[PDB]
Amino acid sequence: ERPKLILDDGKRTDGRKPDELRSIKIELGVLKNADGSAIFEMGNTKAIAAVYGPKEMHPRHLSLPDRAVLRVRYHMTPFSTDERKNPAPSRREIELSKVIREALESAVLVELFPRTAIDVFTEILQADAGSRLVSLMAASLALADAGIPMRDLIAGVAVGKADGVIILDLNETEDMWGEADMPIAMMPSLNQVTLFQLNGSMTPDEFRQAFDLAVKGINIIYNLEREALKSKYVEFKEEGV
Amino acid sequence: ERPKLILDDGKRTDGRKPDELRSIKIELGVLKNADGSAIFEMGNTKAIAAVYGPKEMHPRHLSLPDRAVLRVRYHMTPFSTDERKNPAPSRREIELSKVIREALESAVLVELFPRTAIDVFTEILQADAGSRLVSLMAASLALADAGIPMRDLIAGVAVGKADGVIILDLNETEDMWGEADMPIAMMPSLNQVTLFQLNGSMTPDEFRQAFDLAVKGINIIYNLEREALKSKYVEFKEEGV
Amino acid sequence: REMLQVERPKLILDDGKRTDGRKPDELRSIKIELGVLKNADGSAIFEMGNTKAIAAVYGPKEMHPRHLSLPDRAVLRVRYHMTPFSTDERKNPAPSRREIELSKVIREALESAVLVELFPRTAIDVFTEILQADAGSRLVSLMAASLALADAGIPMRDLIAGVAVGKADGVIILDLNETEDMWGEADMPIAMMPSLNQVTLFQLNGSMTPDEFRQAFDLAVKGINIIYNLEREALKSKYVEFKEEGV
Amino acid sequence: MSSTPSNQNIIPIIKKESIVSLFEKGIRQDGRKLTDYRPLSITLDYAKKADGSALVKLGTTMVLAGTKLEIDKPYEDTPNQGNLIVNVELLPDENAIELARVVDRSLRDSKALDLTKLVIEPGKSVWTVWLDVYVLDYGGNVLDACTLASVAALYNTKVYKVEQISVNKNEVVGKLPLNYPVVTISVAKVDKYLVVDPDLDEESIMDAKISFSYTPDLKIVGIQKSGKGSMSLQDIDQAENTARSTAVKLLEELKKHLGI
Amino acid sequence: MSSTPSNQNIIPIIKKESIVSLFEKGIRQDGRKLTDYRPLSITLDYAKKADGSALVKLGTTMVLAGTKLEIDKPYEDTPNQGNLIVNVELLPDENAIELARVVDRSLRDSKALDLTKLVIEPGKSVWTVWLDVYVLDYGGNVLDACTLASVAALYNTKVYKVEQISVNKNEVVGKLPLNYPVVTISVAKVDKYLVVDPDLDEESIMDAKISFSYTPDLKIVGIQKSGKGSMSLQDIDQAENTARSTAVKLLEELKKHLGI
Amino acid sequence: MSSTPSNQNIIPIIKKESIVSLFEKGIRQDGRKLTDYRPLSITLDYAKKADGSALVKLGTTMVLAGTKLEIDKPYEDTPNQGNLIVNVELLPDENAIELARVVDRSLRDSKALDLTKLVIEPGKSVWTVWLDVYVLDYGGNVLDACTLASVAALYNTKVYKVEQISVNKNEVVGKLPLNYPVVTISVAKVDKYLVVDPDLDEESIMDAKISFSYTPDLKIVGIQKSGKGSMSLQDIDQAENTARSTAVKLLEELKKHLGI
Ligand SMILES: [Cl-]
Ligand SMILES: [Cl-]
Ligand SMILES: [Cl-]
Known part of the structure; x- marks a missing residue:
């Protein structure tokens, strides 16, 4: 019926230790006709993000006098999961779009571009849990790729609870059968949390442990983002935090 | 299998005489963050109305140079009836919104506020027939509560035909099983009809009789509206016209 | 499977003839009238055989939300729509993907003809309704539109005339039935501004050899030229009837 | 959300006064009396692939109604009745919905069409009558034209x-x-006048209108007030007298077109 | 597509400083402490035709939640569970959807409502609980009010x-x-302060807010950060301490209204 | 309602003349001949959770197509047939709908995919092939790229x-x-030139384009004219000659990517 999430050797269903990230792959400037673009991969979760840079906004009443308006789309391709997703936006996609937009708003220096819109389009090409974070990071990097000024880059991981065990960066299996799933995203240099959600169930102690683990994960991802910024392409094989 | 509508002592299913109004309850200024508000109750039909006062209109091409634009929503909460209503607007809700809007347009001195919109939001909290009128009156009073100048207040009742008998202020039972249902609303001081509808079937003579009865009902309601304007709260037990 | 016989009906019958008795090179009957709607700026009814469309034009006018207008041109707004009772089985009045595509295709055809540059910051609304469908609706609609625009006095490069040409039982045919549309190998609607030899609309569904495609194309032109003369005549007299005949 | 139409065709006070000045002499722009209907055409079987159809010209208002019949399972609440579904489209919504419902109500409540006789196998299969009404030319008093088209179809x-x-x-x-x-x-x-079958100009200057629906034995069978303005008690009283005496003439005329 | 709200009522720096100056003395505009909830009213059975209902006043925020139960075939994937469907409407969307989902999640993931006990006939028929939540008056901290209304209803x-x-x-x-x-x-x-149950003014000047959901045994059962700004590691750590110690008081008060 | 796009990027006469001047010497901006296709990449199995997928780069145009198969009862109107459902999304509608239908038609009418061989249990169960085509980078001539991605997927x-x-x-x-x-x-x-596989700049200055679909035997299997402008009889005649001789090269190249 329900899988054993932690095996007798203390390992997870994919062979990872509780404190191990999935593999990471990042590349920038992958789309020619966009102002900024990135592909981000965590294990099997893969997102592409495109930024269409600061630009005068179509109907003026919808613009702002002091700030840029961010317009963000979080979307899953119909073929990103095992069962076909309806391309029509779900309540989940609507919520996550908002949550992601707000995350970006705390980072992007919108005050610099009054009366403009910055469009951020995100597509999940394959989902294996943590999509919202992969999408958010791809967005963050696409904005950087566009040369849009920000407070810092955004790095994120979902931390969670499997068989009473606190674990880092969840599978779909772990998402689906674990006790808790807590996506966390930061501007790491500032120690500022950008997105913070928990679904499932945790004790305050467990919450505090998981939180500490997420930070360590986030810091590793962050160094990779920094490098991806310089070299435009980064690969990272699975390893311990 | 029909219910008898006039029992053999000449009284209706709820015990009322053909010329008796249901109980009335009115209160004003019930919402803090609105410019005007009212709750109106006729028997078990209960509506809340909120007015968001004269204000510059979002997209200017949709405004008018000489007048305010009224925007009116007639809506039934899913839990207002015995069977759950879909919150999505029905053709009925669309028609009644228009009908109610027009009633208000004959009363509200829109010319006073060019290039503005006045938003009137109405919610049926419980339906027991006559909702459109309760909603309309709640609206009228909420506008008064907002201090928006009008020709007069609006008072209304549905008059109808039960078992060949002309009756005042219908039940849901009477609405469903009667021969006729004729909601009528006026600016009573002016003898001006604001809303006038009949569904069902009547002879011209019956139509004229019912009309006369509605006026007597309306005049009683009107005095209560006037009182509610001064004291902010009014209760009225059932009685003969 | 000796007794087994293909469901599909024969489309080319005794003598060179088709299911409605027409020769491969014969148009269906045509009926055109203009100025049929009082409260519109231009209007036309076009009938090809049993396909019947009405078009209404609401003439160059300031456009509602200004950001949707153009500084150098008029915006055409076009609706291609089939009434629920235009076919044997009731069509849902909600627009279909087919109606969405054909609206675009018809709009673009009109844009190549209408001198939109003359009317900056305005919209020209073209509403089309198929009252009966018997194949070729998109073209009847387009022509009805063209004529309604003419009826409104909106300047154009030329009128638009069109026919669907196709392939029936290996035979190339002009102006298809519903039956021929349904069971034929190819259906190729073509519309032109005939005086200019300019193709306004061009589509093929089905299947043809390049040679067949070139033959069918030649046939369409001959058909179009006959329709065109009728359009010209409808412009002067406001009402035109034409019984079936050979190209 | 329902809102005051921003597209309205405003009509200058000066033009309204012209029309009112004529009313005062008991005549209208087009020469008819205050109680007169416009000329009426009805063409039956206009839409050939409809099960029944009617093209109605009332003045410059044109409406094409068409029916289409289908076999459906009935709804559990009414296993001994067929269905009527009315739809209206304005081509030149909300007003379209009102028109549909008002027409529907007056066909249904009058029992002009007997739905209980549309049953094929009780509980299992009944007729659905799809009535689709297309307003092709908006020349004023669309509702009356829609009812005529509907009944005819x-x-x-x-x-x-x-x-x-x-x-x-x-x-x-x-x-x-x-x-x-x-x-x-x-x-x-x-103004202070009551006018039967308002045309386009008349509808744009009117305070309000009120529509009465009648069966041949002159029973009232639907009423709908309409418009941004109001109307007095006496106005409505007179309006129905006028409406009813007009109804007799219109019914006669309708029947002629229908072959009774 | 989600976009920065253009209607947002921008609150002058001068007013923000007033509020912050009070915070610095450990007090707020309405006189409460930084960790205080506003006054709470709950009126049960407010919507009579609902199966259960609650009108919640939290400060000036008013929410009416009502339930409606129906019998449905269960979903293929879950033949032995009933259904909970949460819907939120803001009257004065996207924020409505977020609210609905956040509330839903905290009811569902906590096992506060046991869906497996809503089965009538397994695989054939189960109860669907329709929970409809109407925000009638927007006075800040709508989420907490929605949860209170939902649970009460x-x-x-x-x-x-x-x-x-x-x-x-x-x-x-x-x-x-x-x-x-x-x-x-x-x-x-x-600014540098954490404040429980933010009112309208407070929500307009805040960097961000974070909402923690608790069961009576003080297990965390949902978390949602919200707002265009960010929050530090320590901020979140302190926020949950504060949230949890507040939870105890609020649960007591909720239970009093519910008759435990 | 379909209307002239108000967003389109108007391209100055001066720039158009540059391009036309090059055309007159038989060359283009990027150096290719008037009859040349841009460089083509195809990466198969790009979307791992798709049943089949293809990432196509045609110049700077990028399209990802992915398939997903499901078991359905066959449709009442099409009793012994599997299903193909084509969907196109433009990310950077109406054009999306056109693209889907044009691609669908050319796959269906050519019988490239034999739907009758997608039956599992006749009248009980058949395969539905969901084809979802995502245009990720708009670099001109999106249609040809969509067809390539679709076929490859x-x-x-x-x-x-x-x-x-x-x-x-x-x-x-x-x-x-x-x-x-x-x-x-x-x-x-x-202008007076015909150009194969128009890029972004080329599409913005073109009068119109015409798309021909071919099977390997070089039978014409779909045609679609496109654009605000017109095209002469002779233009179309020449266009298909050119198209067809290009088709041979493109088919060879496609097959190489597919492993034939
Ligand atoms: Cl996620
Ligand atoms: Cl009502
Ligand atoms: Cl067609």
């Missing part, structure tokens, strides 16, 4: 043979179970 | 007799299978 | 074991019943 409707499961569309079996025609008469209040 | 819900197929709505059979109430506590970060 | 599709009712997704049983690839070739009219 219904009377024009052919019912087909039922193979028992299947409809055989080239054997006409009969007509719709219709009890009688119905008419809707709209009376507009302009 | 569920507790207020009457379950009816099942005739076996049919619901008999005048025989009350029992209550919903509820394990415990649940509370959501929102902590706003304003 | 279909050829890349794995069909799974059928447990009889249930799909066993870790036993690959075979491939789609594909008769042949298909290509769509777009020829743009610019």
